[PDB]
CSV table of C-alpha atoms and ligand atoms in Angstrom, one decimal:
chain,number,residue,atom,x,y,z
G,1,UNK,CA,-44.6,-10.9,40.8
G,2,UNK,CA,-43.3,-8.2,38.5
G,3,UNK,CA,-39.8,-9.4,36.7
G,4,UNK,CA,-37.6,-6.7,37.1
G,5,UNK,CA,-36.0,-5.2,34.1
G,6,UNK,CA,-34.1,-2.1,36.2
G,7,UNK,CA,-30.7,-3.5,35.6
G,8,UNK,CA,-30.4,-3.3,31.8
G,9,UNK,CA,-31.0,0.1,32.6
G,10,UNK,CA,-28.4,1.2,35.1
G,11,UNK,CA,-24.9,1.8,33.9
G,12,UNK,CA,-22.7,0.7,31.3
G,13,UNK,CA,-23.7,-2.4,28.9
G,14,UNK,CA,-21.1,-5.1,28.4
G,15,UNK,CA,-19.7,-6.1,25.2
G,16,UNK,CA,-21.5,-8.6,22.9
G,17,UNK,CA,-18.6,-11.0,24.3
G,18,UNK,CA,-19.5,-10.4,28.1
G,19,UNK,CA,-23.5,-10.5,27.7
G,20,UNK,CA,-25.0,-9.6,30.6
G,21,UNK,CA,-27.7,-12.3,31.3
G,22,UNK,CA,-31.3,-12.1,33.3
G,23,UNK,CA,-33.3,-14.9,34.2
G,24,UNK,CA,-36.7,-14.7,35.7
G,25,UNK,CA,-39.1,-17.5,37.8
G,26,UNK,CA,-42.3,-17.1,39.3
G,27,UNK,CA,-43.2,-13.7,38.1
G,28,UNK,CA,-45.1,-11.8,35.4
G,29,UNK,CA,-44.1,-9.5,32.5
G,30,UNK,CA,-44.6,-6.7,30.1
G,31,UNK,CA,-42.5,-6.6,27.5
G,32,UNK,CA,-44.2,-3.9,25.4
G,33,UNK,CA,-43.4,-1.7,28.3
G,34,UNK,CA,-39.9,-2.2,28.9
G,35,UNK,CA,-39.3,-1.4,24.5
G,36,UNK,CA,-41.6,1.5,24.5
G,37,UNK,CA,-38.2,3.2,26.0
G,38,UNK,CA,-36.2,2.5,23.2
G,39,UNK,CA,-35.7,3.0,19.3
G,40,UNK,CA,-36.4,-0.6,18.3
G,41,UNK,CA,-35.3,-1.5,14.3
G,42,UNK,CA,-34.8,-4.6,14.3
G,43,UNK,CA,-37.3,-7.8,16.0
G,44,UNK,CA,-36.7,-11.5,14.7
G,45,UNK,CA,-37.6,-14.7,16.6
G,46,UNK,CA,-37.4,-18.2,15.8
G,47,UNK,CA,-40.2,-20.7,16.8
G,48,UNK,CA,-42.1,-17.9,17.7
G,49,UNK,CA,-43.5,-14.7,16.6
G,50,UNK,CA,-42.7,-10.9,18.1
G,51,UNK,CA,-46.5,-10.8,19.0
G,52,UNK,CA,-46.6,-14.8,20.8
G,53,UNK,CA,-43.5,-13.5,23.1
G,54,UNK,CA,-44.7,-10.6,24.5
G,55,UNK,CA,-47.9,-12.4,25.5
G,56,UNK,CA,-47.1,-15.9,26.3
G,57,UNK,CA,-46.9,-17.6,30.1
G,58,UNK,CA,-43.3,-19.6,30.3
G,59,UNK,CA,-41.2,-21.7,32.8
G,60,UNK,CA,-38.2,-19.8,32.5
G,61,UNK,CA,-37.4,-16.3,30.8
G,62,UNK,CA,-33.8,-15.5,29.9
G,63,UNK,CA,-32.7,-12.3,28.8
G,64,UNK,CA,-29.4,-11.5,27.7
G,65,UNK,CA,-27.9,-7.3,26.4
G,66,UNK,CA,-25.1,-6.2,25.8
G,67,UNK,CA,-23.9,-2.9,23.3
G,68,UNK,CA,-24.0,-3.7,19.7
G,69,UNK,CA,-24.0,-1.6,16.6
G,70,UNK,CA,-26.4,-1.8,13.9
G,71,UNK,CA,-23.7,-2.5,11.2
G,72,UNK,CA,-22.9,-5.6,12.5
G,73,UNK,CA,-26.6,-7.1,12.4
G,74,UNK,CA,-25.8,-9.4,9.6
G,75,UNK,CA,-23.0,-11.4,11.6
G,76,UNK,CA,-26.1,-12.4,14.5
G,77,UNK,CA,-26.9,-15.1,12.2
G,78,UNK,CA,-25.5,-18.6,12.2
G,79,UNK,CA,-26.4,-19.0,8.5
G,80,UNK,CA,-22.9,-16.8,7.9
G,81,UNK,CA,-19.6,-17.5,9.5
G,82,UNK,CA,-19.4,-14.0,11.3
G,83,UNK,CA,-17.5,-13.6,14.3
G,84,UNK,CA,-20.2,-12.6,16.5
G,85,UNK,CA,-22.5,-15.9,16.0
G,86,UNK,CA,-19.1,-18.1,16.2
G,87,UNK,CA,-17.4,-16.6,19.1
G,88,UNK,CA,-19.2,-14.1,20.5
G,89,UNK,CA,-22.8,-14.6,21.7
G,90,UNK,CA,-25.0,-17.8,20.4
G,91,UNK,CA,-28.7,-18.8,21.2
G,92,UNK,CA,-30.1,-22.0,22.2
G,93,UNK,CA,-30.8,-24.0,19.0
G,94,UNK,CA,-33.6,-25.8,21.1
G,95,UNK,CA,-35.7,-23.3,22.7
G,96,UNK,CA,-37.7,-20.6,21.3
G,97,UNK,CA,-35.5,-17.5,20.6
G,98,UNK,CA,-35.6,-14.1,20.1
G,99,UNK,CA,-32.8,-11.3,19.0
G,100,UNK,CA,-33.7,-7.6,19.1
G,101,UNK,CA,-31.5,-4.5,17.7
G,102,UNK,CA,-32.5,-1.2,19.8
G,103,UNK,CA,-31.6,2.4,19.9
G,104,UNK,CA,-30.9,3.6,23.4
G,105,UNK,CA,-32.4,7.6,22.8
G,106,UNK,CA,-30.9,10.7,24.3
G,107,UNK,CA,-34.0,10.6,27.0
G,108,UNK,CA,-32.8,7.6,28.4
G,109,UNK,CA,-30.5,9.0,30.5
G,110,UNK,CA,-30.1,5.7,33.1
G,111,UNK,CA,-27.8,4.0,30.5
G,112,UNK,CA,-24.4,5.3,29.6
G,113,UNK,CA,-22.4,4.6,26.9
G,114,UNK,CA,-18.9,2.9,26.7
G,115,UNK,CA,-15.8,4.2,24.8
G,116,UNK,CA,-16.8,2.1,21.9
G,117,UNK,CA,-17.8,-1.5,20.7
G,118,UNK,CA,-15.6,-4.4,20.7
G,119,UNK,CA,-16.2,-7.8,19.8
G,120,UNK,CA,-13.9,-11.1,19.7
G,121,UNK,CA,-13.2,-11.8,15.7
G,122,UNK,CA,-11.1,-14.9,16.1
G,123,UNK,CA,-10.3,-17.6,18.9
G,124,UNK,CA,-9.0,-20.7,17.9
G,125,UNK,CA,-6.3,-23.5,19.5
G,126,UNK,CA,-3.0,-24.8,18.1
G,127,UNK,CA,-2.1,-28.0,18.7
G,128,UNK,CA,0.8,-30.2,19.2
G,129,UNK,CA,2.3,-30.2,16.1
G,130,UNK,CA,2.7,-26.1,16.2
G,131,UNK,CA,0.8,-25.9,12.7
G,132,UNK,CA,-2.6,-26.6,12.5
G,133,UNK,CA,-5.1,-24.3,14.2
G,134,UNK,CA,-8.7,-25.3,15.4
G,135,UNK,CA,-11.3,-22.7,16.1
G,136,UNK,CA,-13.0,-22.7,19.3
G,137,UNK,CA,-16.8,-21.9,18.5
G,138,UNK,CA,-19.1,-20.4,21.1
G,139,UNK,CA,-21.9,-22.7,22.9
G,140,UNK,CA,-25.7,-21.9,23.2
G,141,UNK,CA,-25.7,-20.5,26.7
G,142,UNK,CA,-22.1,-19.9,27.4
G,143,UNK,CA,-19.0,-17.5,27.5
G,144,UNK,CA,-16.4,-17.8,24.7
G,145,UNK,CA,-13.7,-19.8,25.6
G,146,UNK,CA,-11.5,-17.1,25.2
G,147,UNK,CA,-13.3,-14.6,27.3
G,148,UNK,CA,-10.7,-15.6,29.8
G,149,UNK,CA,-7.7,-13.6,28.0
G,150,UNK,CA,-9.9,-11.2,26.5
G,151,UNK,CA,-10.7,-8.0,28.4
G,152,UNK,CA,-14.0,-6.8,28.8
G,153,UNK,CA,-12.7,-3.5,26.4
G,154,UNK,CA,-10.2,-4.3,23.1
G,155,UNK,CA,-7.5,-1.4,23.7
G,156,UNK,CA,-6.6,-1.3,20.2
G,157,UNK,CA,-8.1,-2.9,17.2
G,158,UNK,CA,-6.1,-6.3,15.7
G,159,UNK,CA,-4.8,-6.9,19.7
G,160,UNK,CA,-3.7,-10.3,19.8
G,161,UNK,CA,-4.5,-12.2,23.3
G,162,UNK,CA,-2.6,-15.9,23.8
G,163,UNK,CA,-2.4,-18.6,27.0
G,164,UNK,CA,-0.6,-21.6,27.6
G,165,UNK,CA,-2.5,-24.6,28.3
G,166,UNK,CA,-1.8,-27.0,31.0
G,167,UNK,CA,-1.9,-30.7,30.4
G,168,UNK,CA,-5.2,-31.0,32.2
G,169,UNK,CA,-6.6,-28.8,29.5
G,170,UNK,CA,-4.7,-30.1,26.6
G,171,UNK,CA,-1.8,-28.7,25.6
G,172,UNK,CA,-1.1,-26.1,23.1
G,173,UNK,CA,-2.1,-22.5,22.7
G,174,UNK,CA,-5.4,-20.6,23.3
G,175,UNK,CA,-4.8,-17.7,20.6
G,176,UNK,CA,-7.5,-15.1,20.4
G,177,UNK,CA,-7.7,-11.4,18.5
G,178,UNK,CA,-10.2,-8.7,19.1
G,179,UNK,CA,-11.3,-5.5,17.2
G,180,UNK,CA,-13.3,-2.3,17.8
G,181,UNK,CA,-16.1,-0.2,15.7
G,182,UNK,CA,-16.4,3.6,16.9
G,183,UNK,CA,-19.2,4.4,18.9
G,184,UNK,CA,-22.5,5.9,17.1
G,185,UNK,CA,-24.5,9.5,17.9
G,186,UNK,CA,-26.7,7.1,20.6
G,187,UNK,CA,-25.7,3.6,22.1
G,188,UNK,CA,-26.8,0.3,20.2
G,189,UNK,CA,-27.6,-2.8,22.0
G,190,UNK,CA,-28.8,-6.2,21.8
G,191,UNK,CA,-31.5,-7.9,23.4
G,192,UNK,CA,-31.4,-11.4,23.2
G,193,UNK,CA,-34.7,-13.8,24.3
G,194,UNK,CA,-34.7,-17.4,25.6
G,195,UNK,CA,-37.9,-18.9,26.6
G,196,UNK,CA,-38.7,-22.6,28.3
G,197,UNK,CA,-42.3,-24.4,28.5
G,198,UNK,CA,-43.0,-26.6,31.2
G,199,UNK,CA,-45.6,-29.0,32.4
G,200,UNK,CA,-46.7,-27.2,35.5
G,201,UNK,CA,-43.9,-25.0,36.0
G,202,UNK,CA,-45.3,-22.2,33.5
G,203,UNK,CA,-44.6,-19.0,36.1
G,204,UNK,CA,-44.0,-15.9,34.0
G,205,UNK,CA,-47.0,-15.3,32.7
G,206,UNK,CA,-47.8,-11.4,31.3
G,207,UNK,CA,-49.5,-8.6,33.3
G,208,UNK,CA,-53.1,-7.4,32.7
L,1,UNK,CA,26.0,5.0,2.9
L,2,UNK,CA,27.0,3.6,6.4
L,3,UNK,CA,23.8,2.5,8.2
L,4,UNK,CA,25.6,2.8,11.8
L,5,UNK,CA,24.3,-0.1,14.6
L,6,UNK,CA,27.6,0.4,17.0
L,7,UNK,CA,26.0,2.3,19.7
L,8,UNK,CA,23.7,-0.8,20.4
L,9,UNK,CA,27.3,-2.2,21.2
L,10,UNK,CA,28.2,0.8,23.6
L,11,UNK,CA,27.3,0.9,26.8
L,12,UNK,CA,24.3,-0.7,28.7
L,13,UNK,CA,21.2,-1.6,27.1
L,14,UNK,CA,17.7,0.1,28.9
L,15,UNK,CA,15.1,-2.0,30.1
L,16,UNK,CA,11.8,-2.8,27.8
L,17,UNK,CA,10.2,-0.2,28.7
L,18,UNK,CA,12.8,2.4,27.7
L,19,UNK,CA,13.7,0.7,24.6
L,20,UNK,CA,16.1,3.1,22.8
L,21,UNK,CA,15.0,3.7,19.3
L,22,UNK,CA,17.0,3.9,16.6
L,23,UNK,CA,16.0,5.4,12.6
L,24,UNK,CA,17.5,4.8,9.6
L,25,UNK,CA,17.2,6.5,6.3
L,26,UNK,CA,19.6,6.7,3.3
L,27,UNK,CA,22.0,4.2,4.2
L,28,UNK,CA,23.6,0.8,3.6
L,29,UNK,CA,22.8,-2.0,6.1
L,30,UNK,CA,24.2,-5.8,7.0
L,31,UNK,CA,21.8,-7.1,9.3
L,32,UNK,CA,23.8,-10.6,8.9
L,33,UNK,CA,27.0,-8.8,10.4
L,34,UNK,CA,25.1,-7.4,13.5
L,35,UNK,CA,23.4,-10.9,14.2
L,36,UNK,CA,26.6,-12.6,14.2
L,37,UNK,CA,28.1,-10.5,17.2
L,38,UNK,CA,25.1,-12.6,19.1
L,39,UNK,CA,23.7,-15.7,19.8
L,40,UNK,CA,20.5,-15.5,18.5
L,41,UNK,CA,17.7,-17.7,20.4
L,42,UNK,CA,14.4,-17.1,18.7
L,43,UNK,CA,13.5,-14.9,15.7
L,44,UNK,CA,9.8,-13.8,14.7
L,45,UNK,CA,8.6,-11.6,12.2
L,46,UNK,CA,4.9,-10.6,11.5
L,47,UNK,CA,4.3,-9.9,7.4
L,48,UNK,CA,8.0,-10.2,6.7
L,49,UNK,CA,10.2,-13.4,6.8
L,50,UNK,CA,13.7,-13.2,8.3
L,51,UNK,CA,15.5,-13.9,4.5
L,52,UNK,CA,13.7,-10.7,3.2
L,53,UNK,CA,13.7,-8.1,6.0
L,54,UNK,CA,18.1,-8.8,5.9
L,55,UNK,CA,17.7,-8.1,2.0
L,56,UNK,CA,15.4,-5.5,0.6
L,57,UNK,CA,15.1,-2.3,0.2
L,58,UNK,CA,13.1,0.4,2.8
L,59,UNK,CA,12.0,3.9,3.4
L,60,UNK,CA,12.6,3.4,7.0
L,61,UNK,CA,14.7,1.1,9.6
L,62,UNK,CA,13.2,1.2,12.7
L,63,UNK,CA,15.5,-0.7,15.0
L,64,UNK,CA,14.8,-0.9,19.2
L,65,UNK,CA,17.0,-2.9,21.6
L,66,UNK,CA,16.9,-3.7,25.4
L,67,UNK,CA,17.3,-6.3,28.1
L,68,UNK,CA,14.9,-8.9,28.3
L,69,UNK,CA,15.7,-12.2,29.4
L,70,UNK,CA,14.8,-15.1,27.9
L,71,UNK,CA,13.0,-17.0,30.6
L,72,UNK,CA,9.9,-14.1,29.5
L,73,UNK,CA,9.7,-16.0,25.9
L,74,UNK,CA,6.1,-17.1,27.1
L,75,UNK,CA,5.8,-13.4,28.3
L,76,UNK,CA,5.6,-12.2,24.6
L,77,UNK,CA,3.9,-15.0,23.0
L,78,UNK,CA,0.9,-14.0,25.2
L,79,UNK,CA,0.9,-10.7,24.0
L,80,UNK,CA,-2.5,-8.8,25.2
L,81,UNK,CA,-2.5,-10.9,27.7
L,82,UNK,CA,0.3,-10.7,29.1
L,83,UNK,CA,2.3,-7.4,31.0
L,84,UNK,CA,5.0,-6.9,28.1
L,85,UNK,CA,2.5,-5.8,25.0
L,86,UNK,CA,0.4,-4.2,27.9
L,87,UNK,CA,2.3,-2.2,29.2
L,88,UNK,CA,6.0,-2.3,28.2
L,89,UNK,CA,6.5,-2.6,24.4
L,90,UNK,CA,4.1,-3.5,21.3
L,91,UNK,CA,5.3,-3.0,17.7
L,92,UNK,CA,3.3,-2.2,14.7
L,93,UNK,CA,-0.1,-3.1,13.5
L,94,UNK,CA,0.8,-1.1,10.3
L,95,UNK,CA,4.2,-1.6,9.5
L,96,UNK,CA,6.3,-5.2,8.8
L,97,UNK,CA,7.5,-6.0,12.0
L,98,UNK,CA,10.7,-8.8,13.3
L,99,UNK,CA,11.5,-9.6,17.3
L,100,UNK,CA,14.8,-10.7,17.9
L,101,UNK,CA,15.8,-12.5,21.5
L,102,UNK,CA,19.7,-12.6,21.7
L,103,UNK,CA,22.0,-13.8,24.2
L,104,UNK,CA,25.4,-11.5,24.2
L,105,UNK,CA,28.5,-13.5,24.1
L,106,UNK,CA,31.4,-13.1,26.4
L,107,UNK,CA,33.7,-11.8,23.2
L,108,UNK,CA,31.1,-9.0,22.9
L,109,UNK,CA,32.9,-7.2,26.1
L,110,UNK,CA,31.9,-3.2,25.1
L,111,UNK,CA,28.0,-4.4,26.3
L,112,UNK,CA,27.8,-4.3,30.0
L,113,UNK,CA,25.3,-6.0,31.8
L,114,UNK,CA,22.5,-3.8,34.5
L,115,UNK,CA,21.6,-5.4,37.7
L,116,UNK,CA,18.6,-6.9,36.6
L,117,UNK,CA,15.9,-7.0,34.5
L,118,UNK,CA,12.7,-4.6,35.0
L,119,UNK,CA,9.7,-4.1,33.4
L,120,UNK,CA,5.9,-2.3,34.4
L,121,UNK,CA,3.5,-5.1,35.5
L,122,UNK,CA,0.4,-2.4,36.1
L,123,UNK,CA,0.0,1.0,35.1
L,124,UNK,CA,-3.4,2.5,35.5
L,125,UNK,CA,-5.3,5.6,36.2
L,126,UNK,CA,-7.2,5.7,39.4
L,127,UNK,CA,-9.7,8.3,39.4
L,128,UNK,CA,-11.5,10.7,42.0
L,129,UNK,CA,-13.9,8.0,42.8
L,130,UNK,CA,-11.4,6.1,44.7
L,131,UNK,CA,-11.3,3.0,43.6
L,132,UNK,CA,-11.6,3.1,39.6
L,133,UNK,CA,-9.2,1.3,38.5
L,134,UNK,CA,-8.5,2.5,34.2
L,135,UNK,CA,-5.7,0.6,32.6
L,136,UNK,CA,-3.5,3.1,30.7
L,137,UNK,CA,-2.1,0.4,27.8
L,138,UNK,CA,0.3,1.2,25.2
L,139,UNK,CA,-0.2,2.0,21.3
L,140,UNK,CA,2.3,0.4,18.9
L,141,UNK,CA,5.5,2.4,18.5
L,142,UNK,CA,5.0,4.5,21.4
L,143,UNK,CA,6.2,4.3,25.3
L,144,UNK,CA,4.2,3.2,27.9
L,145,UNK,CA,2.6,6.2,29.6
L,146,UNK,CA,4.2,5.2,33.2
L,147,UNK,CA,7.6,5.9,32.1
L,148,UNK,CA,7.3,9.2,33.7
L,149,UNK,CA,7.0,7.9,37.1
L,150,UNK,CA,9.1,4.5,36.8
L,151,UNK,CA,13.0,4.6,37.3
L,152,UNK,CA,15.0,3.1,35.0
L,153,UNK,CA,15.6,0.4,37.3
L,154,UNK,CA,12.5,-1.2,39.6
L,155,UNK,CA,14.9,-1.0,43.0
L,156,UNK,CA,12.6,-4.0,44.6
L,157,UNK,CA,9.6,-5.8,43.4
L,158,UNK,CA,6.4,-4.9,43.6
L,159,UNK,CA,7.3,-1.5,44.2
L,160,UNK,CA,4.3,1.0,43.7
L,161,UNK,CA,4.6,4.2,42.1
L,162,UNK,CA,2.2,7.4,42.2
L,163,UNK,CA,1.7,11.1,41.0
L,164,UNK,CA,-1.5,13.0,40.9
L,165,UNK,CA,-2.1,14.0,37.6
L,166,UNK,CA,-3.6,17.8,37.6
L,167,UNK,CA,-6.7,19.5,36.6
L,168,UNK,CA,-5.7,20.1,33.0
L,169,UNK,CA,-4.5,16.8,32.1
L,170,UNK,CA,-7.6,15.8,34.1
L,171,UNK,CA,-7.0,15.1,37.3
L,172,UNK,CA,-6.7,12.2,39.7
L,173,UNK,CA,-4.0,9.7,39.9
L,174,UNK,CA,-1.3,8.1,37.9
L,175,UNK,CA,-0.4,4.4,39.8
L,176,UNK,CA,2.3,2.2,38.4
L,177,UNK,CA,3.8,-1.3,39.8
L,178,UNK,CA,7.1,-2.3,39.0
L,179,UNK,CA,8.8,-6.2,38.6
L,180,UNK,CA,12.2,-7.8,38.3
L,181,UNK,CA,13.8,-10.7,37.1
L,182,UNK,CA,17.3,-11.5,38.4
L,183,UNK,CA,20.5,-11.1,35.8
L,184,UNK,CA,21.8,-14.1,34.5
L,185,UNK,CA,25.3,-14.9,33.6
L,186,UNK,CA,25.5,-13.0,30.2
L,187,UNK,CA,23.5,-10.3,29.4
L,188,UNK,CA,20.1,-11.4,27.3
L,189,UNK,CA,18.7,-8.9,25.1
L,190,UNK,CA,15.7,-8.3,22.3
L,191,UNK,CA,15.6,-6.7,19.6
L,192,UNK,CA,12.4,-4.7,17.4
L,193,UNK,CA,13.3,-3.9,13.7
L,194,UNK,CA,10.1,-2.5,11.8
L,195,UNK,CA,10.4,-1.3,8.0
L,196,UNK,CA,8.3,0.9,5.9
L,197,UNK,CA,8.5,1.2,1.9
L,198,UNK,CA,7.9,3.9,0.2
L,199,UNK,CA,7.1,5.5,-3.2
L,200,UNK,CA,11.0,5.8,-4.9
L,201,UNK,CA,12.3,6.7,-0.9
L,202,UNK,CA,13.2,3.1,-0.3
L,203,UNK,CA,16.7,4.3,0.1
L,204,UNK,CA,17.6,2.1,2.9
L,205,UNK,CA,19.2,-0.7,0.6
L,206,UNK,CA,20.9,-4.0,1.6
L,207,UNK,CA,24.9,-3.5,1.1
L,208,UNK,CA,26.4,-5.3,-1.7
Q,301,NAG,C1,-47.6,-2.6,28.9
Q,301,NAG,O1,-47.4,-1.2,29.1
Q,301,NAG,C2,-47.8,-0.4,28.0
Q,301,NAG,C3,-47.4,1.0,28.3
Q,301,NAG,O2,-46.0,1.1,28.4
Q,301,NAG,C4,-49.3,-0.6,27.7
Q,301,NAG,O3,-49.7,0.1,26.6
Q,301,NAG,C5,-49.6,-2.0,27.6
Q,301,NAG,O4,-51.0,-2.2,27.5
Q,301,NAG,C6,-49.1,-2.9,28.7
Q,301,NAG,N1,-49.3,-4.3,28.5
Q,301,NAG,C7,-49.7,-5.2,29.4
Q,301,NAG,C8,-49.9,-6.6,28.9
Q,301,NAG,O5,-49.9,-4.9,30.5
């Protein structure tokens, strides 16, 4: 009973790279309670509607945040090639989705802000032949591949990060770069939804 | 006139992370001439090819030497991820930048070798919450902030190093962690050149 949402609210939120995720079974929900405490501007879903989400029973809810600034809300979208959708965080193309922009307020004191925003901007693979490089795009559901040589802050912005692959793993270079955006007045984040339907299994269903 | 790169040739070269840093303005240089005192192993340049940094004109010559061996190639191909561009030495973002790795040659007798090659494999900042752990990296074309508490030879590694940092700095520690790499046979050293250009300043000239 009662799907816990503390944990999004204590401490630092990672980068959009190192998304924090939640996943609730067997319990119920209200949404419209947990983003009352926030400045929300921006609310899309796909395969389902703002108003459906918040008041539907599921299988599974997943719920990934992280600290994201408002400029960059035109590279969440896998129509454009932004960095973010390719190698940064990428939704389930198969399941009904949701992606919210919030406003942390002064009020919410629980949540503290990082030194700034970074994000991956490129992570791609040389081969054999020293020449060509391949970019390594981000899976529904997973890290970036690069998340391994990337730390969870960029010092500086246009830091380069490279590994040596092993035979087992191919061969050539993993070669990624990251880059920063100044912090705002109050934190950013991101809220990203995944929900599942079952057969039976329907057990987060919302409070009344 | 006279661009002077003789006291790289005098004495014994620092370790990486006391690169000595030399400036040029308003002077005549042959890079050619300095490169054939050595055997030159690998030479990289970022936004500047090795032909045109050895033949136009600047407003500034940057040029830092020290030992490294050449068995830490990988160790700077890396770079972010790696301890070198973490905590030893990082060029420009800004500014055309070359890295030269050079074996000295047994003519080349004014160059004596050290005892072996150092360089800082941690240098954070724990505070006084005793554990926190905050990476203190370094910012292109500037030392490592660890210098102050590393000697300019690691004596054994895996030595540790610590000072308390006081209340008006901010207060807590300072830790560093020093590493070695035996000398080899002749002396292995790398070199930094960065460039700027100016408005009519480019006096640094190619001599002809
Ligand atoms: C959720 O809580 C809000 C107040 O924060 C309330 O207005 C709303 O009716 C609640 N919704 C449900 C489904 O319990």
């Amino acid at each position: 009973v009662e799907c816990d949402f503390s944990p999004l609210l204590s401490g630092t939120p990672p980068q959009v790279y190192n998304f924090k995720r939640l996943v609730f079974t067997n319990c119920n929900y209200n949404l419209t309670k947990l983003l009352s405490l926030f400045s929300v501007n921006d609310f899309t879903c796909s395969q389902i509607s703002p108003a459906a989400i918040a008041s539907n029973c599921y299988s599974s809810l997943i719920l990934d945040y992280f600290s994201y600034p408002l400029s960059m809300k035109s590279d969440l979208s896998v129509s454009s090639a932004g960095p973010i959708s390719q190698f940064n965080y990428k939704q389930s193309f198969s399941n009904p989705t949701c992606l919210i922009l919030a406003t942390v307020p002064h009020n919410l004191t629980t949540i503290t802000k990082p030194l700034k925003y970074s994000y991956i901007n490129k992570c791609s693979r040389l081969l054999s032949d020293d020449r060509t490089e391949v970019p390594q795009l981000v899976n529904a559901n997973q890290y970036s591949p690069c998340v391994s040589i990337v730390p969870s802050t960029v010092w500086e912005d246009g830091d380069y990060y490279r590994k040596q692959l092993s035979p087992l793993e191919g061969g050539g270079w993993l070669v990624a770069s990251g880059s920063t955006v100044a912090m705002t007045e109050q934190l950013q984040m991101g809220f990203g939804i995944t929900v599942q339907y079952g057969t039976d299994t329907n057990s987060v269903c919302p409070k009344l």
